[PDB]
Design an enzyme around this catalytic site. Structure first.
Site, PDB file in Angstrom:
ATOM      1  N   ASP A  43      14.571  -1.321  -6.177  1.00  0.00           N
ATOM      2  CA  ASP A  43      15.259  -1.523  -7.455  1.00  0.00           C
ATOM      3  C   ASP A  43      14.434  -0.918  -8.588  1.00  0.00           C
ATOM      4  O   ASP A  43      13.301  -1.346  -8.837  1.00  0.00           O
ATOM      5  CB  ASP A  43      15.504  -3.011  -7.714  1.00  0.00           C
ATOM      6  CG  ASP A  43      16.414  -3.274  -8.930  1.00  0.00           C
ATOM      7  OD1 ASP A  43      17.642  -3.089  -8.822  1.00  0.00           O
ATOM      8  OD2 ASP A  43      15.900  -3.705  -9.993  1.00  0.00           O
ATOM      9  N   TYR A  48      11.993   0.914 -17.420  1.00  0.00           N
ATOM     10  CA  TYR A  48      10.674   0.535 -16.941  1.00  0.00           C
ATOM     11  C   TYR A  48       9.690   1.683 -17.060  1.00  0.00           C
ATOM     12  O   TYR A  48       8.493   1.459 -16.908  1.00  0.00           O
ATOM     13  CB  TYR A  48      10.713   0.060 -15.486  1.00  0.00           C
ATOM     14  CG  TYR A  48      11.684  -1.069 -15.180  1.00  0.00           C
ATOM     15  CD1 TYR A  48      12.241  -1.852 -16.187  1.00  0.00           C
ATOM     16  CD2 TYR A  48      12.037  -1.355 -13.867  1.00  0.00           C
ATOM     17  CE1 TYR A  48      13.147  -2.880 -15.889  1.00  0.00           C
ATOM     18  CE2 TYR A  48      12.926  -2.375 -13.559  1.00  0.00           C
ATOM     19  CZ  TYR A  48      13.483  -3.135 -14.568  1.00  0.00           C
ATOM     20  OH  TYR A  48      14.376  -4.146 -14.240  1.00  0.00           O
ATOM     21  N   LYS A  77      19.260   1.987 -13.395  1.00  0.00           N
ATOM     22  CA  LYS A  77      20.041   1.318 -14.425  1.00  0.00           C
ATOM     23  C   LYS A  77      20.217   2.211 -15.645  1.00  0.00           C
ATOM     24  O   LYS A  77      19.347   3.005 -15.987  1.00  0.00           O
ATOM     25  CB  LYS A  77      19.368  -0.014 -14.822  1.00  0.00           C
ATOM     26  CG  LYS A  77      19.060  -0.870 -13.609  1.00  0.00           C
ATOM     27  CD  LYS A  77      18.629  -2.259 -13.976  1.00  0.00           C
ATOM     28  CE  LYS A  77      18.276  -3.040 -12.723  1.00  0.00           C
ATOM     29  NZ  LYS A  77      16.987  -2.555 -12.142  1.00  0.00           N
ATOM     30  N   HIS A 110      22.636  -1.815 -17.442  1.00  0.00           N
ATOM     31  CA  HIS A 110      21.524  -2.767 -17.510  1.00  0.00           C
ATOM     32  C   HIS A 110      21.897  -4.070 -18.229  1.00  0.00           C
ATOM     33  O   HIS A 110      21.614  -5.162 -17.721  1.00  0.00           O
ATOM     34  CB  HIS A 110      20.301  -2.124 -18.179  1.00  0.00           C
ATOM     35  CG  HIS A 110      19.001  -2.686 -17.684  1.00  0.00           C
ATOM     36  ND1 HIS A 110      17.847  -1.938 -17.581  1.00  0.00           N
ATOM     37  CD2 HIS A 110      18.688  -3.924 -17.227  1.00  0.00           C
ATOM     38  CE1 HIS A 110      16.879  -2.692 -17.092  1.00  0.00           C
ATOM     39  NE2 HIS A 110      17.363  -3.903 -16.873  1.00  0.00           N
ATOM     40  N   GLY A 205      11.363 -16.726  -9.630  1.00  0.00           N
ATOM     41  CA  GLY A 205      11.223 -17.266 -10.963  1.00  0.00           C
ATOM     42  C   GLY A 205      10.171 -16.568 -11.782  1.00  0.00           C
ATOM     43  O   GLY A 205       9.629 -17.169 -12.712  1.00  0.00           O
ATOM     44  N   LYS A 251       9.386  -8.855  -6.583  1.00  0.00           N
ATOM     45  CA  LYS A 251       8.436  -7.896  -7.131  1.00  0.00           C
ATOM     46  C   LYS A 251       7.027  -8.299  -6.717  1.00  0.00           C
ATOM     47  O   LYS A 251       6.610  -9.436  -6.956  1.00  0.00           O
ATOM     48  CB  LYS A 251       8.536  -7.839  -8.660  1.00  0.00           C
ATOM     49  CG  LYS A 251       7.509  -6.903  -9.363  1.00  0.00           C
ATOM     50  CD  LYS A 251       6.143  -7.594  -9.615  1.00  0.00           C
ATOM     51  CE  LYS A 251       5.254  -6.892 -10.652  1.00  0.00           C
ATOM     52  NZ  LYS A 251       4.030  -7.727 -10.940  1.00  0.00           N
TER      53      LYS A 251
HETATM   54  N1  LIG Z   1      18.182  -6.113 -14.424  1.00  0.00           N
HETATM   55  C1  LIG Z   1      17.387  -6.981 -15.059  1.00  0.00           C
HETATM   56  O1  LIG Z   1      17.658  -7.475 -16.150  1.00  0.00           O
HETATM   57  C2  LIG Z   1      16.128  -7.408 -14.385  1.00  0.00           C
HETATM   58  C3  LIG Z   1      15.283  -8.301 -15.037  1.00  0.00           C
HETATM   59  C4  LIG Z   1      14.129  -8.701 -14.375  1.00  0.00           C
HETATM   60  C5  LIG Z   1      13.868  -8.198 -13.101  1.00  0.00           C
HETATM   61  N2  LIG Z   1      14.696  -7.328 -12.473  1.00  0.00           N
HETATM   62  C6  LIG Z   1      14.384  -6.795 -11.123  1.00  0.00           C
HETATM   63  O2  LIG Z   1      14.095  -7.828 -10.159  1.00  0.00           O
HETATM   64  C7  LIG Z   1      12.729  -7.736  -9.731  1.00  0.00           C
HETATM   65  C8  LIG Z   1      12.067  -9.105  -9.511  1.00  0.00           C
HETATM   66  O3  LIG Z   1      12.032  -9.995 -10.625  1.00  0.00           O
HETATM   67  P1  LIG Z   1      10.649 -10.292 -11.413  1.00  0.00           P
HETATM   68  O4  LIG Z   1       9.749  -9.090 -11.278  1.00  0.00           O
HETATM   69  O5  LIG Z   1      11.075 -10.652 -12.820  1.00  0.00           O
HETATM   70  O6  LIG Z   1      10.021 -11.659 -10.762  1.00  0.00           O
HETATM   71  P2  LIG Z   1       9.860 -12.193  -9.215  1.00  0.00           P
HETATM   72  O7  LIG Z   1      10.037 -11.105  -8.184  1.00  0.00           O
HETATM   73  O8  LIG Z   1      10.627 -13.476  -9.051  1.00  0.00           O
HETATM   74  O9  LIG Z   1       8.301 -12.616  -9.214  1.00  0.00           O
HETATM   75  C9  LIG Z   1       7.304 -11.625  -9.466  1.00  0.00           C
HETATM   76  C10 LIG Z   1       5.923 -12.269  -9.507  1.00  0.00           C
HETATM   77  O10 LIG Z   1       5.764 -13.070  -8.337  1.00  0.00           O
HETATM   78  C11 LIG Z   1       4.536 -12.739  -7.676  1.00  0.00           C
HETATM   79  N3  LIG Z   1       4.753 -12.848  -6.207  1.00  0.00           N
HETATM   80  C12 LIG Z   1       5.322 -11.901  -5.428  1.00  0.00           C
HETATM   81  N4  LIG Z   1       5.374 -12.293  -4.129  1.00  0.00           N
HETATM   82  C13 LIG Z   1       4.830 -13.527  -4.062  1.00  0.00           C
HETATM   83  C14 LIG Z   1       4.585 -14.522  -2.987  1.00  0.00           C
HETATM   84  N5  LIG Z   1       4.933 -14.242  -1.699  1.00  0.00           N
HETATM   85  N6  LIG Z   1       3.976 -15.693  -3.338  1.00  0.00           N
HETATM   86  C15 LIG Z   1       3.619 -15.956  -4.613  1.00  0.00           C
HETATM   87  N7  LIG Z   1       3.826 -15.099  -5.633  1.00  0.00           N
HETATM   88  C16 LIG Z   1       4.416 -13.891  -5.430  1.00  0.00           C
HETATM   89  C17 LIG Z   1       4.177 -11.321  -8.116  1.00  0.00           C
HETATM   90  O11 LIG Z   1       2.764 -11.097  -8.159  1.00  0.00           O
HETATM   91  P3  LIG Z   1       2.005  -9.985  -7.259  1.00  0.00           P
HETATM   92  O12 LIG Z   1       2.415  -8.673  -7.890  1.00  0.00           O
HETATM   93  O13 LIG Z   1       0.529 -10.282  -7.402  1.00  0.00           O
HETATM   94  O14 LIG Z   1       2.500 -10.243  -5.852  1.00  0.00           O
HETATM   95  C18 LIG Z   1       4.812 -11.219  -9.496  1.00  0.00           C
HETATM   96  O15 LIG Z   1       3.859 -11.498 -10.532  1.00  0.00           O
HETATM   97  C19 LIG Z   1      12.040  -6.925 -10.817  1.00  0.00           C
HETATM   98  O16 LIG Z   1      10.805  -6.337 -10.420  1.00  0.00           O
HETATM   99  C20 LIG Z   1      13.127  -5.947 -11.235  1.00  0.00           C
HETATM  100  O17 LIG Z   1      13.222  -4.813 -10.356  1.00  0.00           O
HETATM  101  C21 LIG Z   1      15.819  -6.932 -13.106  1.00  0.00           C
HETATM  102  O1  LIG Z   2      15.978  -6.708 -18.136  1.00  0.00           O
HETATM  103  C1  LIG Z   2      15.184  -5.746 -17.900  1.00  0.00           C
HETATM  104  O2  LIG Z   2      14.554  -5.674 -16.804  1.00  0.00           O
HETATM  105  C2  LIG Z   2      15.004  -4.656 -18.957  1.00  0.00           C
HETATM  106  N1  LIG Z   2      14.750  -5.252 -20.253  1.00  0.00           N
HETATM  107  C3  LIG Z   2      13.808  -6.340 -20.044  1.00  0.00           C
HETATM  108  P1  LIG Z   2      13.222  -7.076 -21.647  1.00  0.00           P
HETATM  109  O3  LIG Z   2      13.281  -6.031 -22.743  1.00  0.00           O
HETATM  110  O4  LIG Z   2      14.058  -8.297 -22.005  1.00  0.00           O
HETATM  111  O5  LIG Z   2      11.775  -7.469 -21.426  1.00  0.00           O
END
Ligand SMILES: NC(=O)c1ccc[n+]([C@@H]2O[C@H](COP(=O)([O-])OP(=O)(O)OC[C@H]3O[C@@H](n4cnc5c(N)ncnc54)[C@H](OP(=O)(O)O)[C@@H]3O)[C@@H](O)[C@H]2O)c1
Ligand SMILES: O=C(O)C[NH2+]CP(=O)(O)O
Length: 309
Positions: A43, A48, A77, A110, A205, A251
């Site tokens: 993704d 980004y 996106k 997005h 989360g 992530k």
């Molecule tokens: N479209 C949108 O609006 C939008 C918004 C937000 C995110 N996204 C997408 O969704 C993805 C994921 O969401 P997110 O990055 O916000 O948060 P997330 O994946 O829920 O959590 C990321 C955090 O969790 C840690 N983590 C990862 N694996 C783990 C495990 N097995 N145990 C404990 N901790 C762990 C990571 O640290 P480490 O790096 O040290 O593992 C990182 O700091 C994004 O990267 C992005 O591509 C889209």
């Molecule tokens: O939703 C996304 O991943 C792109 N904007 C994120 P924001 O600008 O709210 O930090």
């Protein structure tokens, strides 16, 4: 349990690697490690600003024959400043070029928010959105083959329905924050009624995102289920989403956690423990504050999310 089928017929890998907030220096290594560990879904987003580095990791993966292009599901996106219809296909071409791909498997709008082209999110750059006219242009990208599927991100039930109602090409995906602390039950049912697939973002989360203040892995229900099943909380949070039929985008830049995030396929959460997720209290972590504003079309958080709050 490894794939879900989109309304186009294509398979979306259940686990994808999120790349938001992975600094350019390290995102290539992570995409590389995840794909060699067995990931088939990445993704991305142009906002980004790390797609060039993601592109080079992909091409190295292709060059070593770790996978072929058709083996991978690549999403990106359309950012808020490219909603104008002649801007849409150009913004897709830019992300295609940076990724060094010929097509995306998925291209998402997005946010349901618009600012004039080349400007930042600031109240003198807001333009009232025209999602139908932007979706028309997303459709022509689909027709031309540049996006295998098109969909949206951060769209409430109402907004997704308002788009489906006018669309020729139904959005394949609505990608939204979804995790045991924000279970999206309303939008989940609506997606099931509509044939739209739900991809969960921030499925852990987002513990590393300071401002959102997420402690989902620390819920006692999840910790309890984690040790009754002999799994980590992260695995159980992800498994919960996959068992509701949602794809997940964990992530990570840690190799060992990258691999455990994949180990969500061959074990279940029994119904007895699944029931207990209803006892987890519900807070939306990413509120969208940056587009809720006296001068925004969304003056309340309730206006942006349509009560899904
Ligand atoms: N479209 C949108 O609006 C939008 C918004 C937000 C995110 N996204 C997408 O969704 C993805 C994921 O969401 P997110 O990055 O916000 O948060 P997330 O994946 O829920 O959590 C990321 C955090 O969790 C840690 N983590 C990862 N694996 C783990 C495990 N097995 N145990 C404990 N901790 C762990 C990571 O640290 P480490 O790096 O040290 O593992 C990182 O700091 C994004 O990267 C992005 O591509 C889209
Ligand atoms: O939703 C996304 O991943 C792109 N904007 C994120 P924001 O600008 O709210 O930090």
């Amino acid at each position: 349990a490894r794939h879900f089928v989109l309304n186009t017929g294509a398979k979306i890998p259940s686990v994808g690697l999120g790349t938001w907030q992975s600094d350019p220096g390290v995102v290539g290594d992570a995409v590389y490690t995840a794909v060699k560990a067995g990931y088939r879904h990445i993704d991305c987003a142009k906002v980004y600003g790390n797609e060039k580095e993601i592109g080079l990791a992909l091409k190295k993966l292709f060059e070593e024959g770790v996978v072929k292009r058709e083996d991978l599901f690549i999403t990106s996106k359309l950012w808020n400043d490219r909603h104008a219809p002649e801007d849409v296909p150009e913004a897709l071409n830019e992300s295609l070029t940076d990724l060094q791909l010929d097509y995306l498997d998925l291209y998402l709008i997005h946010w349901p928010f618009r600012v004039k082209k080349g400007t930042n999110t600031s109240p003198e750059n807001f333009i009232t959105p025209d999602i139908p006219a932007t979706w028309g242009a997303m459709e022509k990208c689909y027709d031309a083959g540049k996006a295998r599927a098109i969909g949206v991100s951060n769209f409430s039930s109402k907004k997704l329905g308002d788009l489906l109602a006018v669309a020729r090409v139904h959005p394949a995906v609505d990608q939204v924050e979804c995790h045991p602390g924000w279970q999206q039950t309303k939008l989940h049912n609506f997606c099931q009624s509509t044939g739209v697939h739900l991809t969960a973002y921030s499925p852990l989360g987002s513990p590393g995102t300071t401002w959102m203040n997420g402690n989902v892995l620390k819920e006692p229900v999840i910790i309890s289920i984690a040790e009754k099943l002999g799994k980590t909380p992260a695995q159980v949070a992800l498994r919960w989403n996959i068992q509701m039929g949602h794809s997940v985008l964990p992530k990570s830049t840690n190799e060992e956690r990258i691999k455990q995030n994949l180990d969500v396929y061959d074990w279940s959460i029994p119904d007895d423990l699944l029931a207990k997720f209803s006892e987890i209290k519900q807070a939306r972590l990413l509120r969208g504050n940056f587009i809720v504003n006296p001068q925004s079309v969304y003056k309340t958080h309730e206006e942006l999310w349509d009560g899904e709050l």
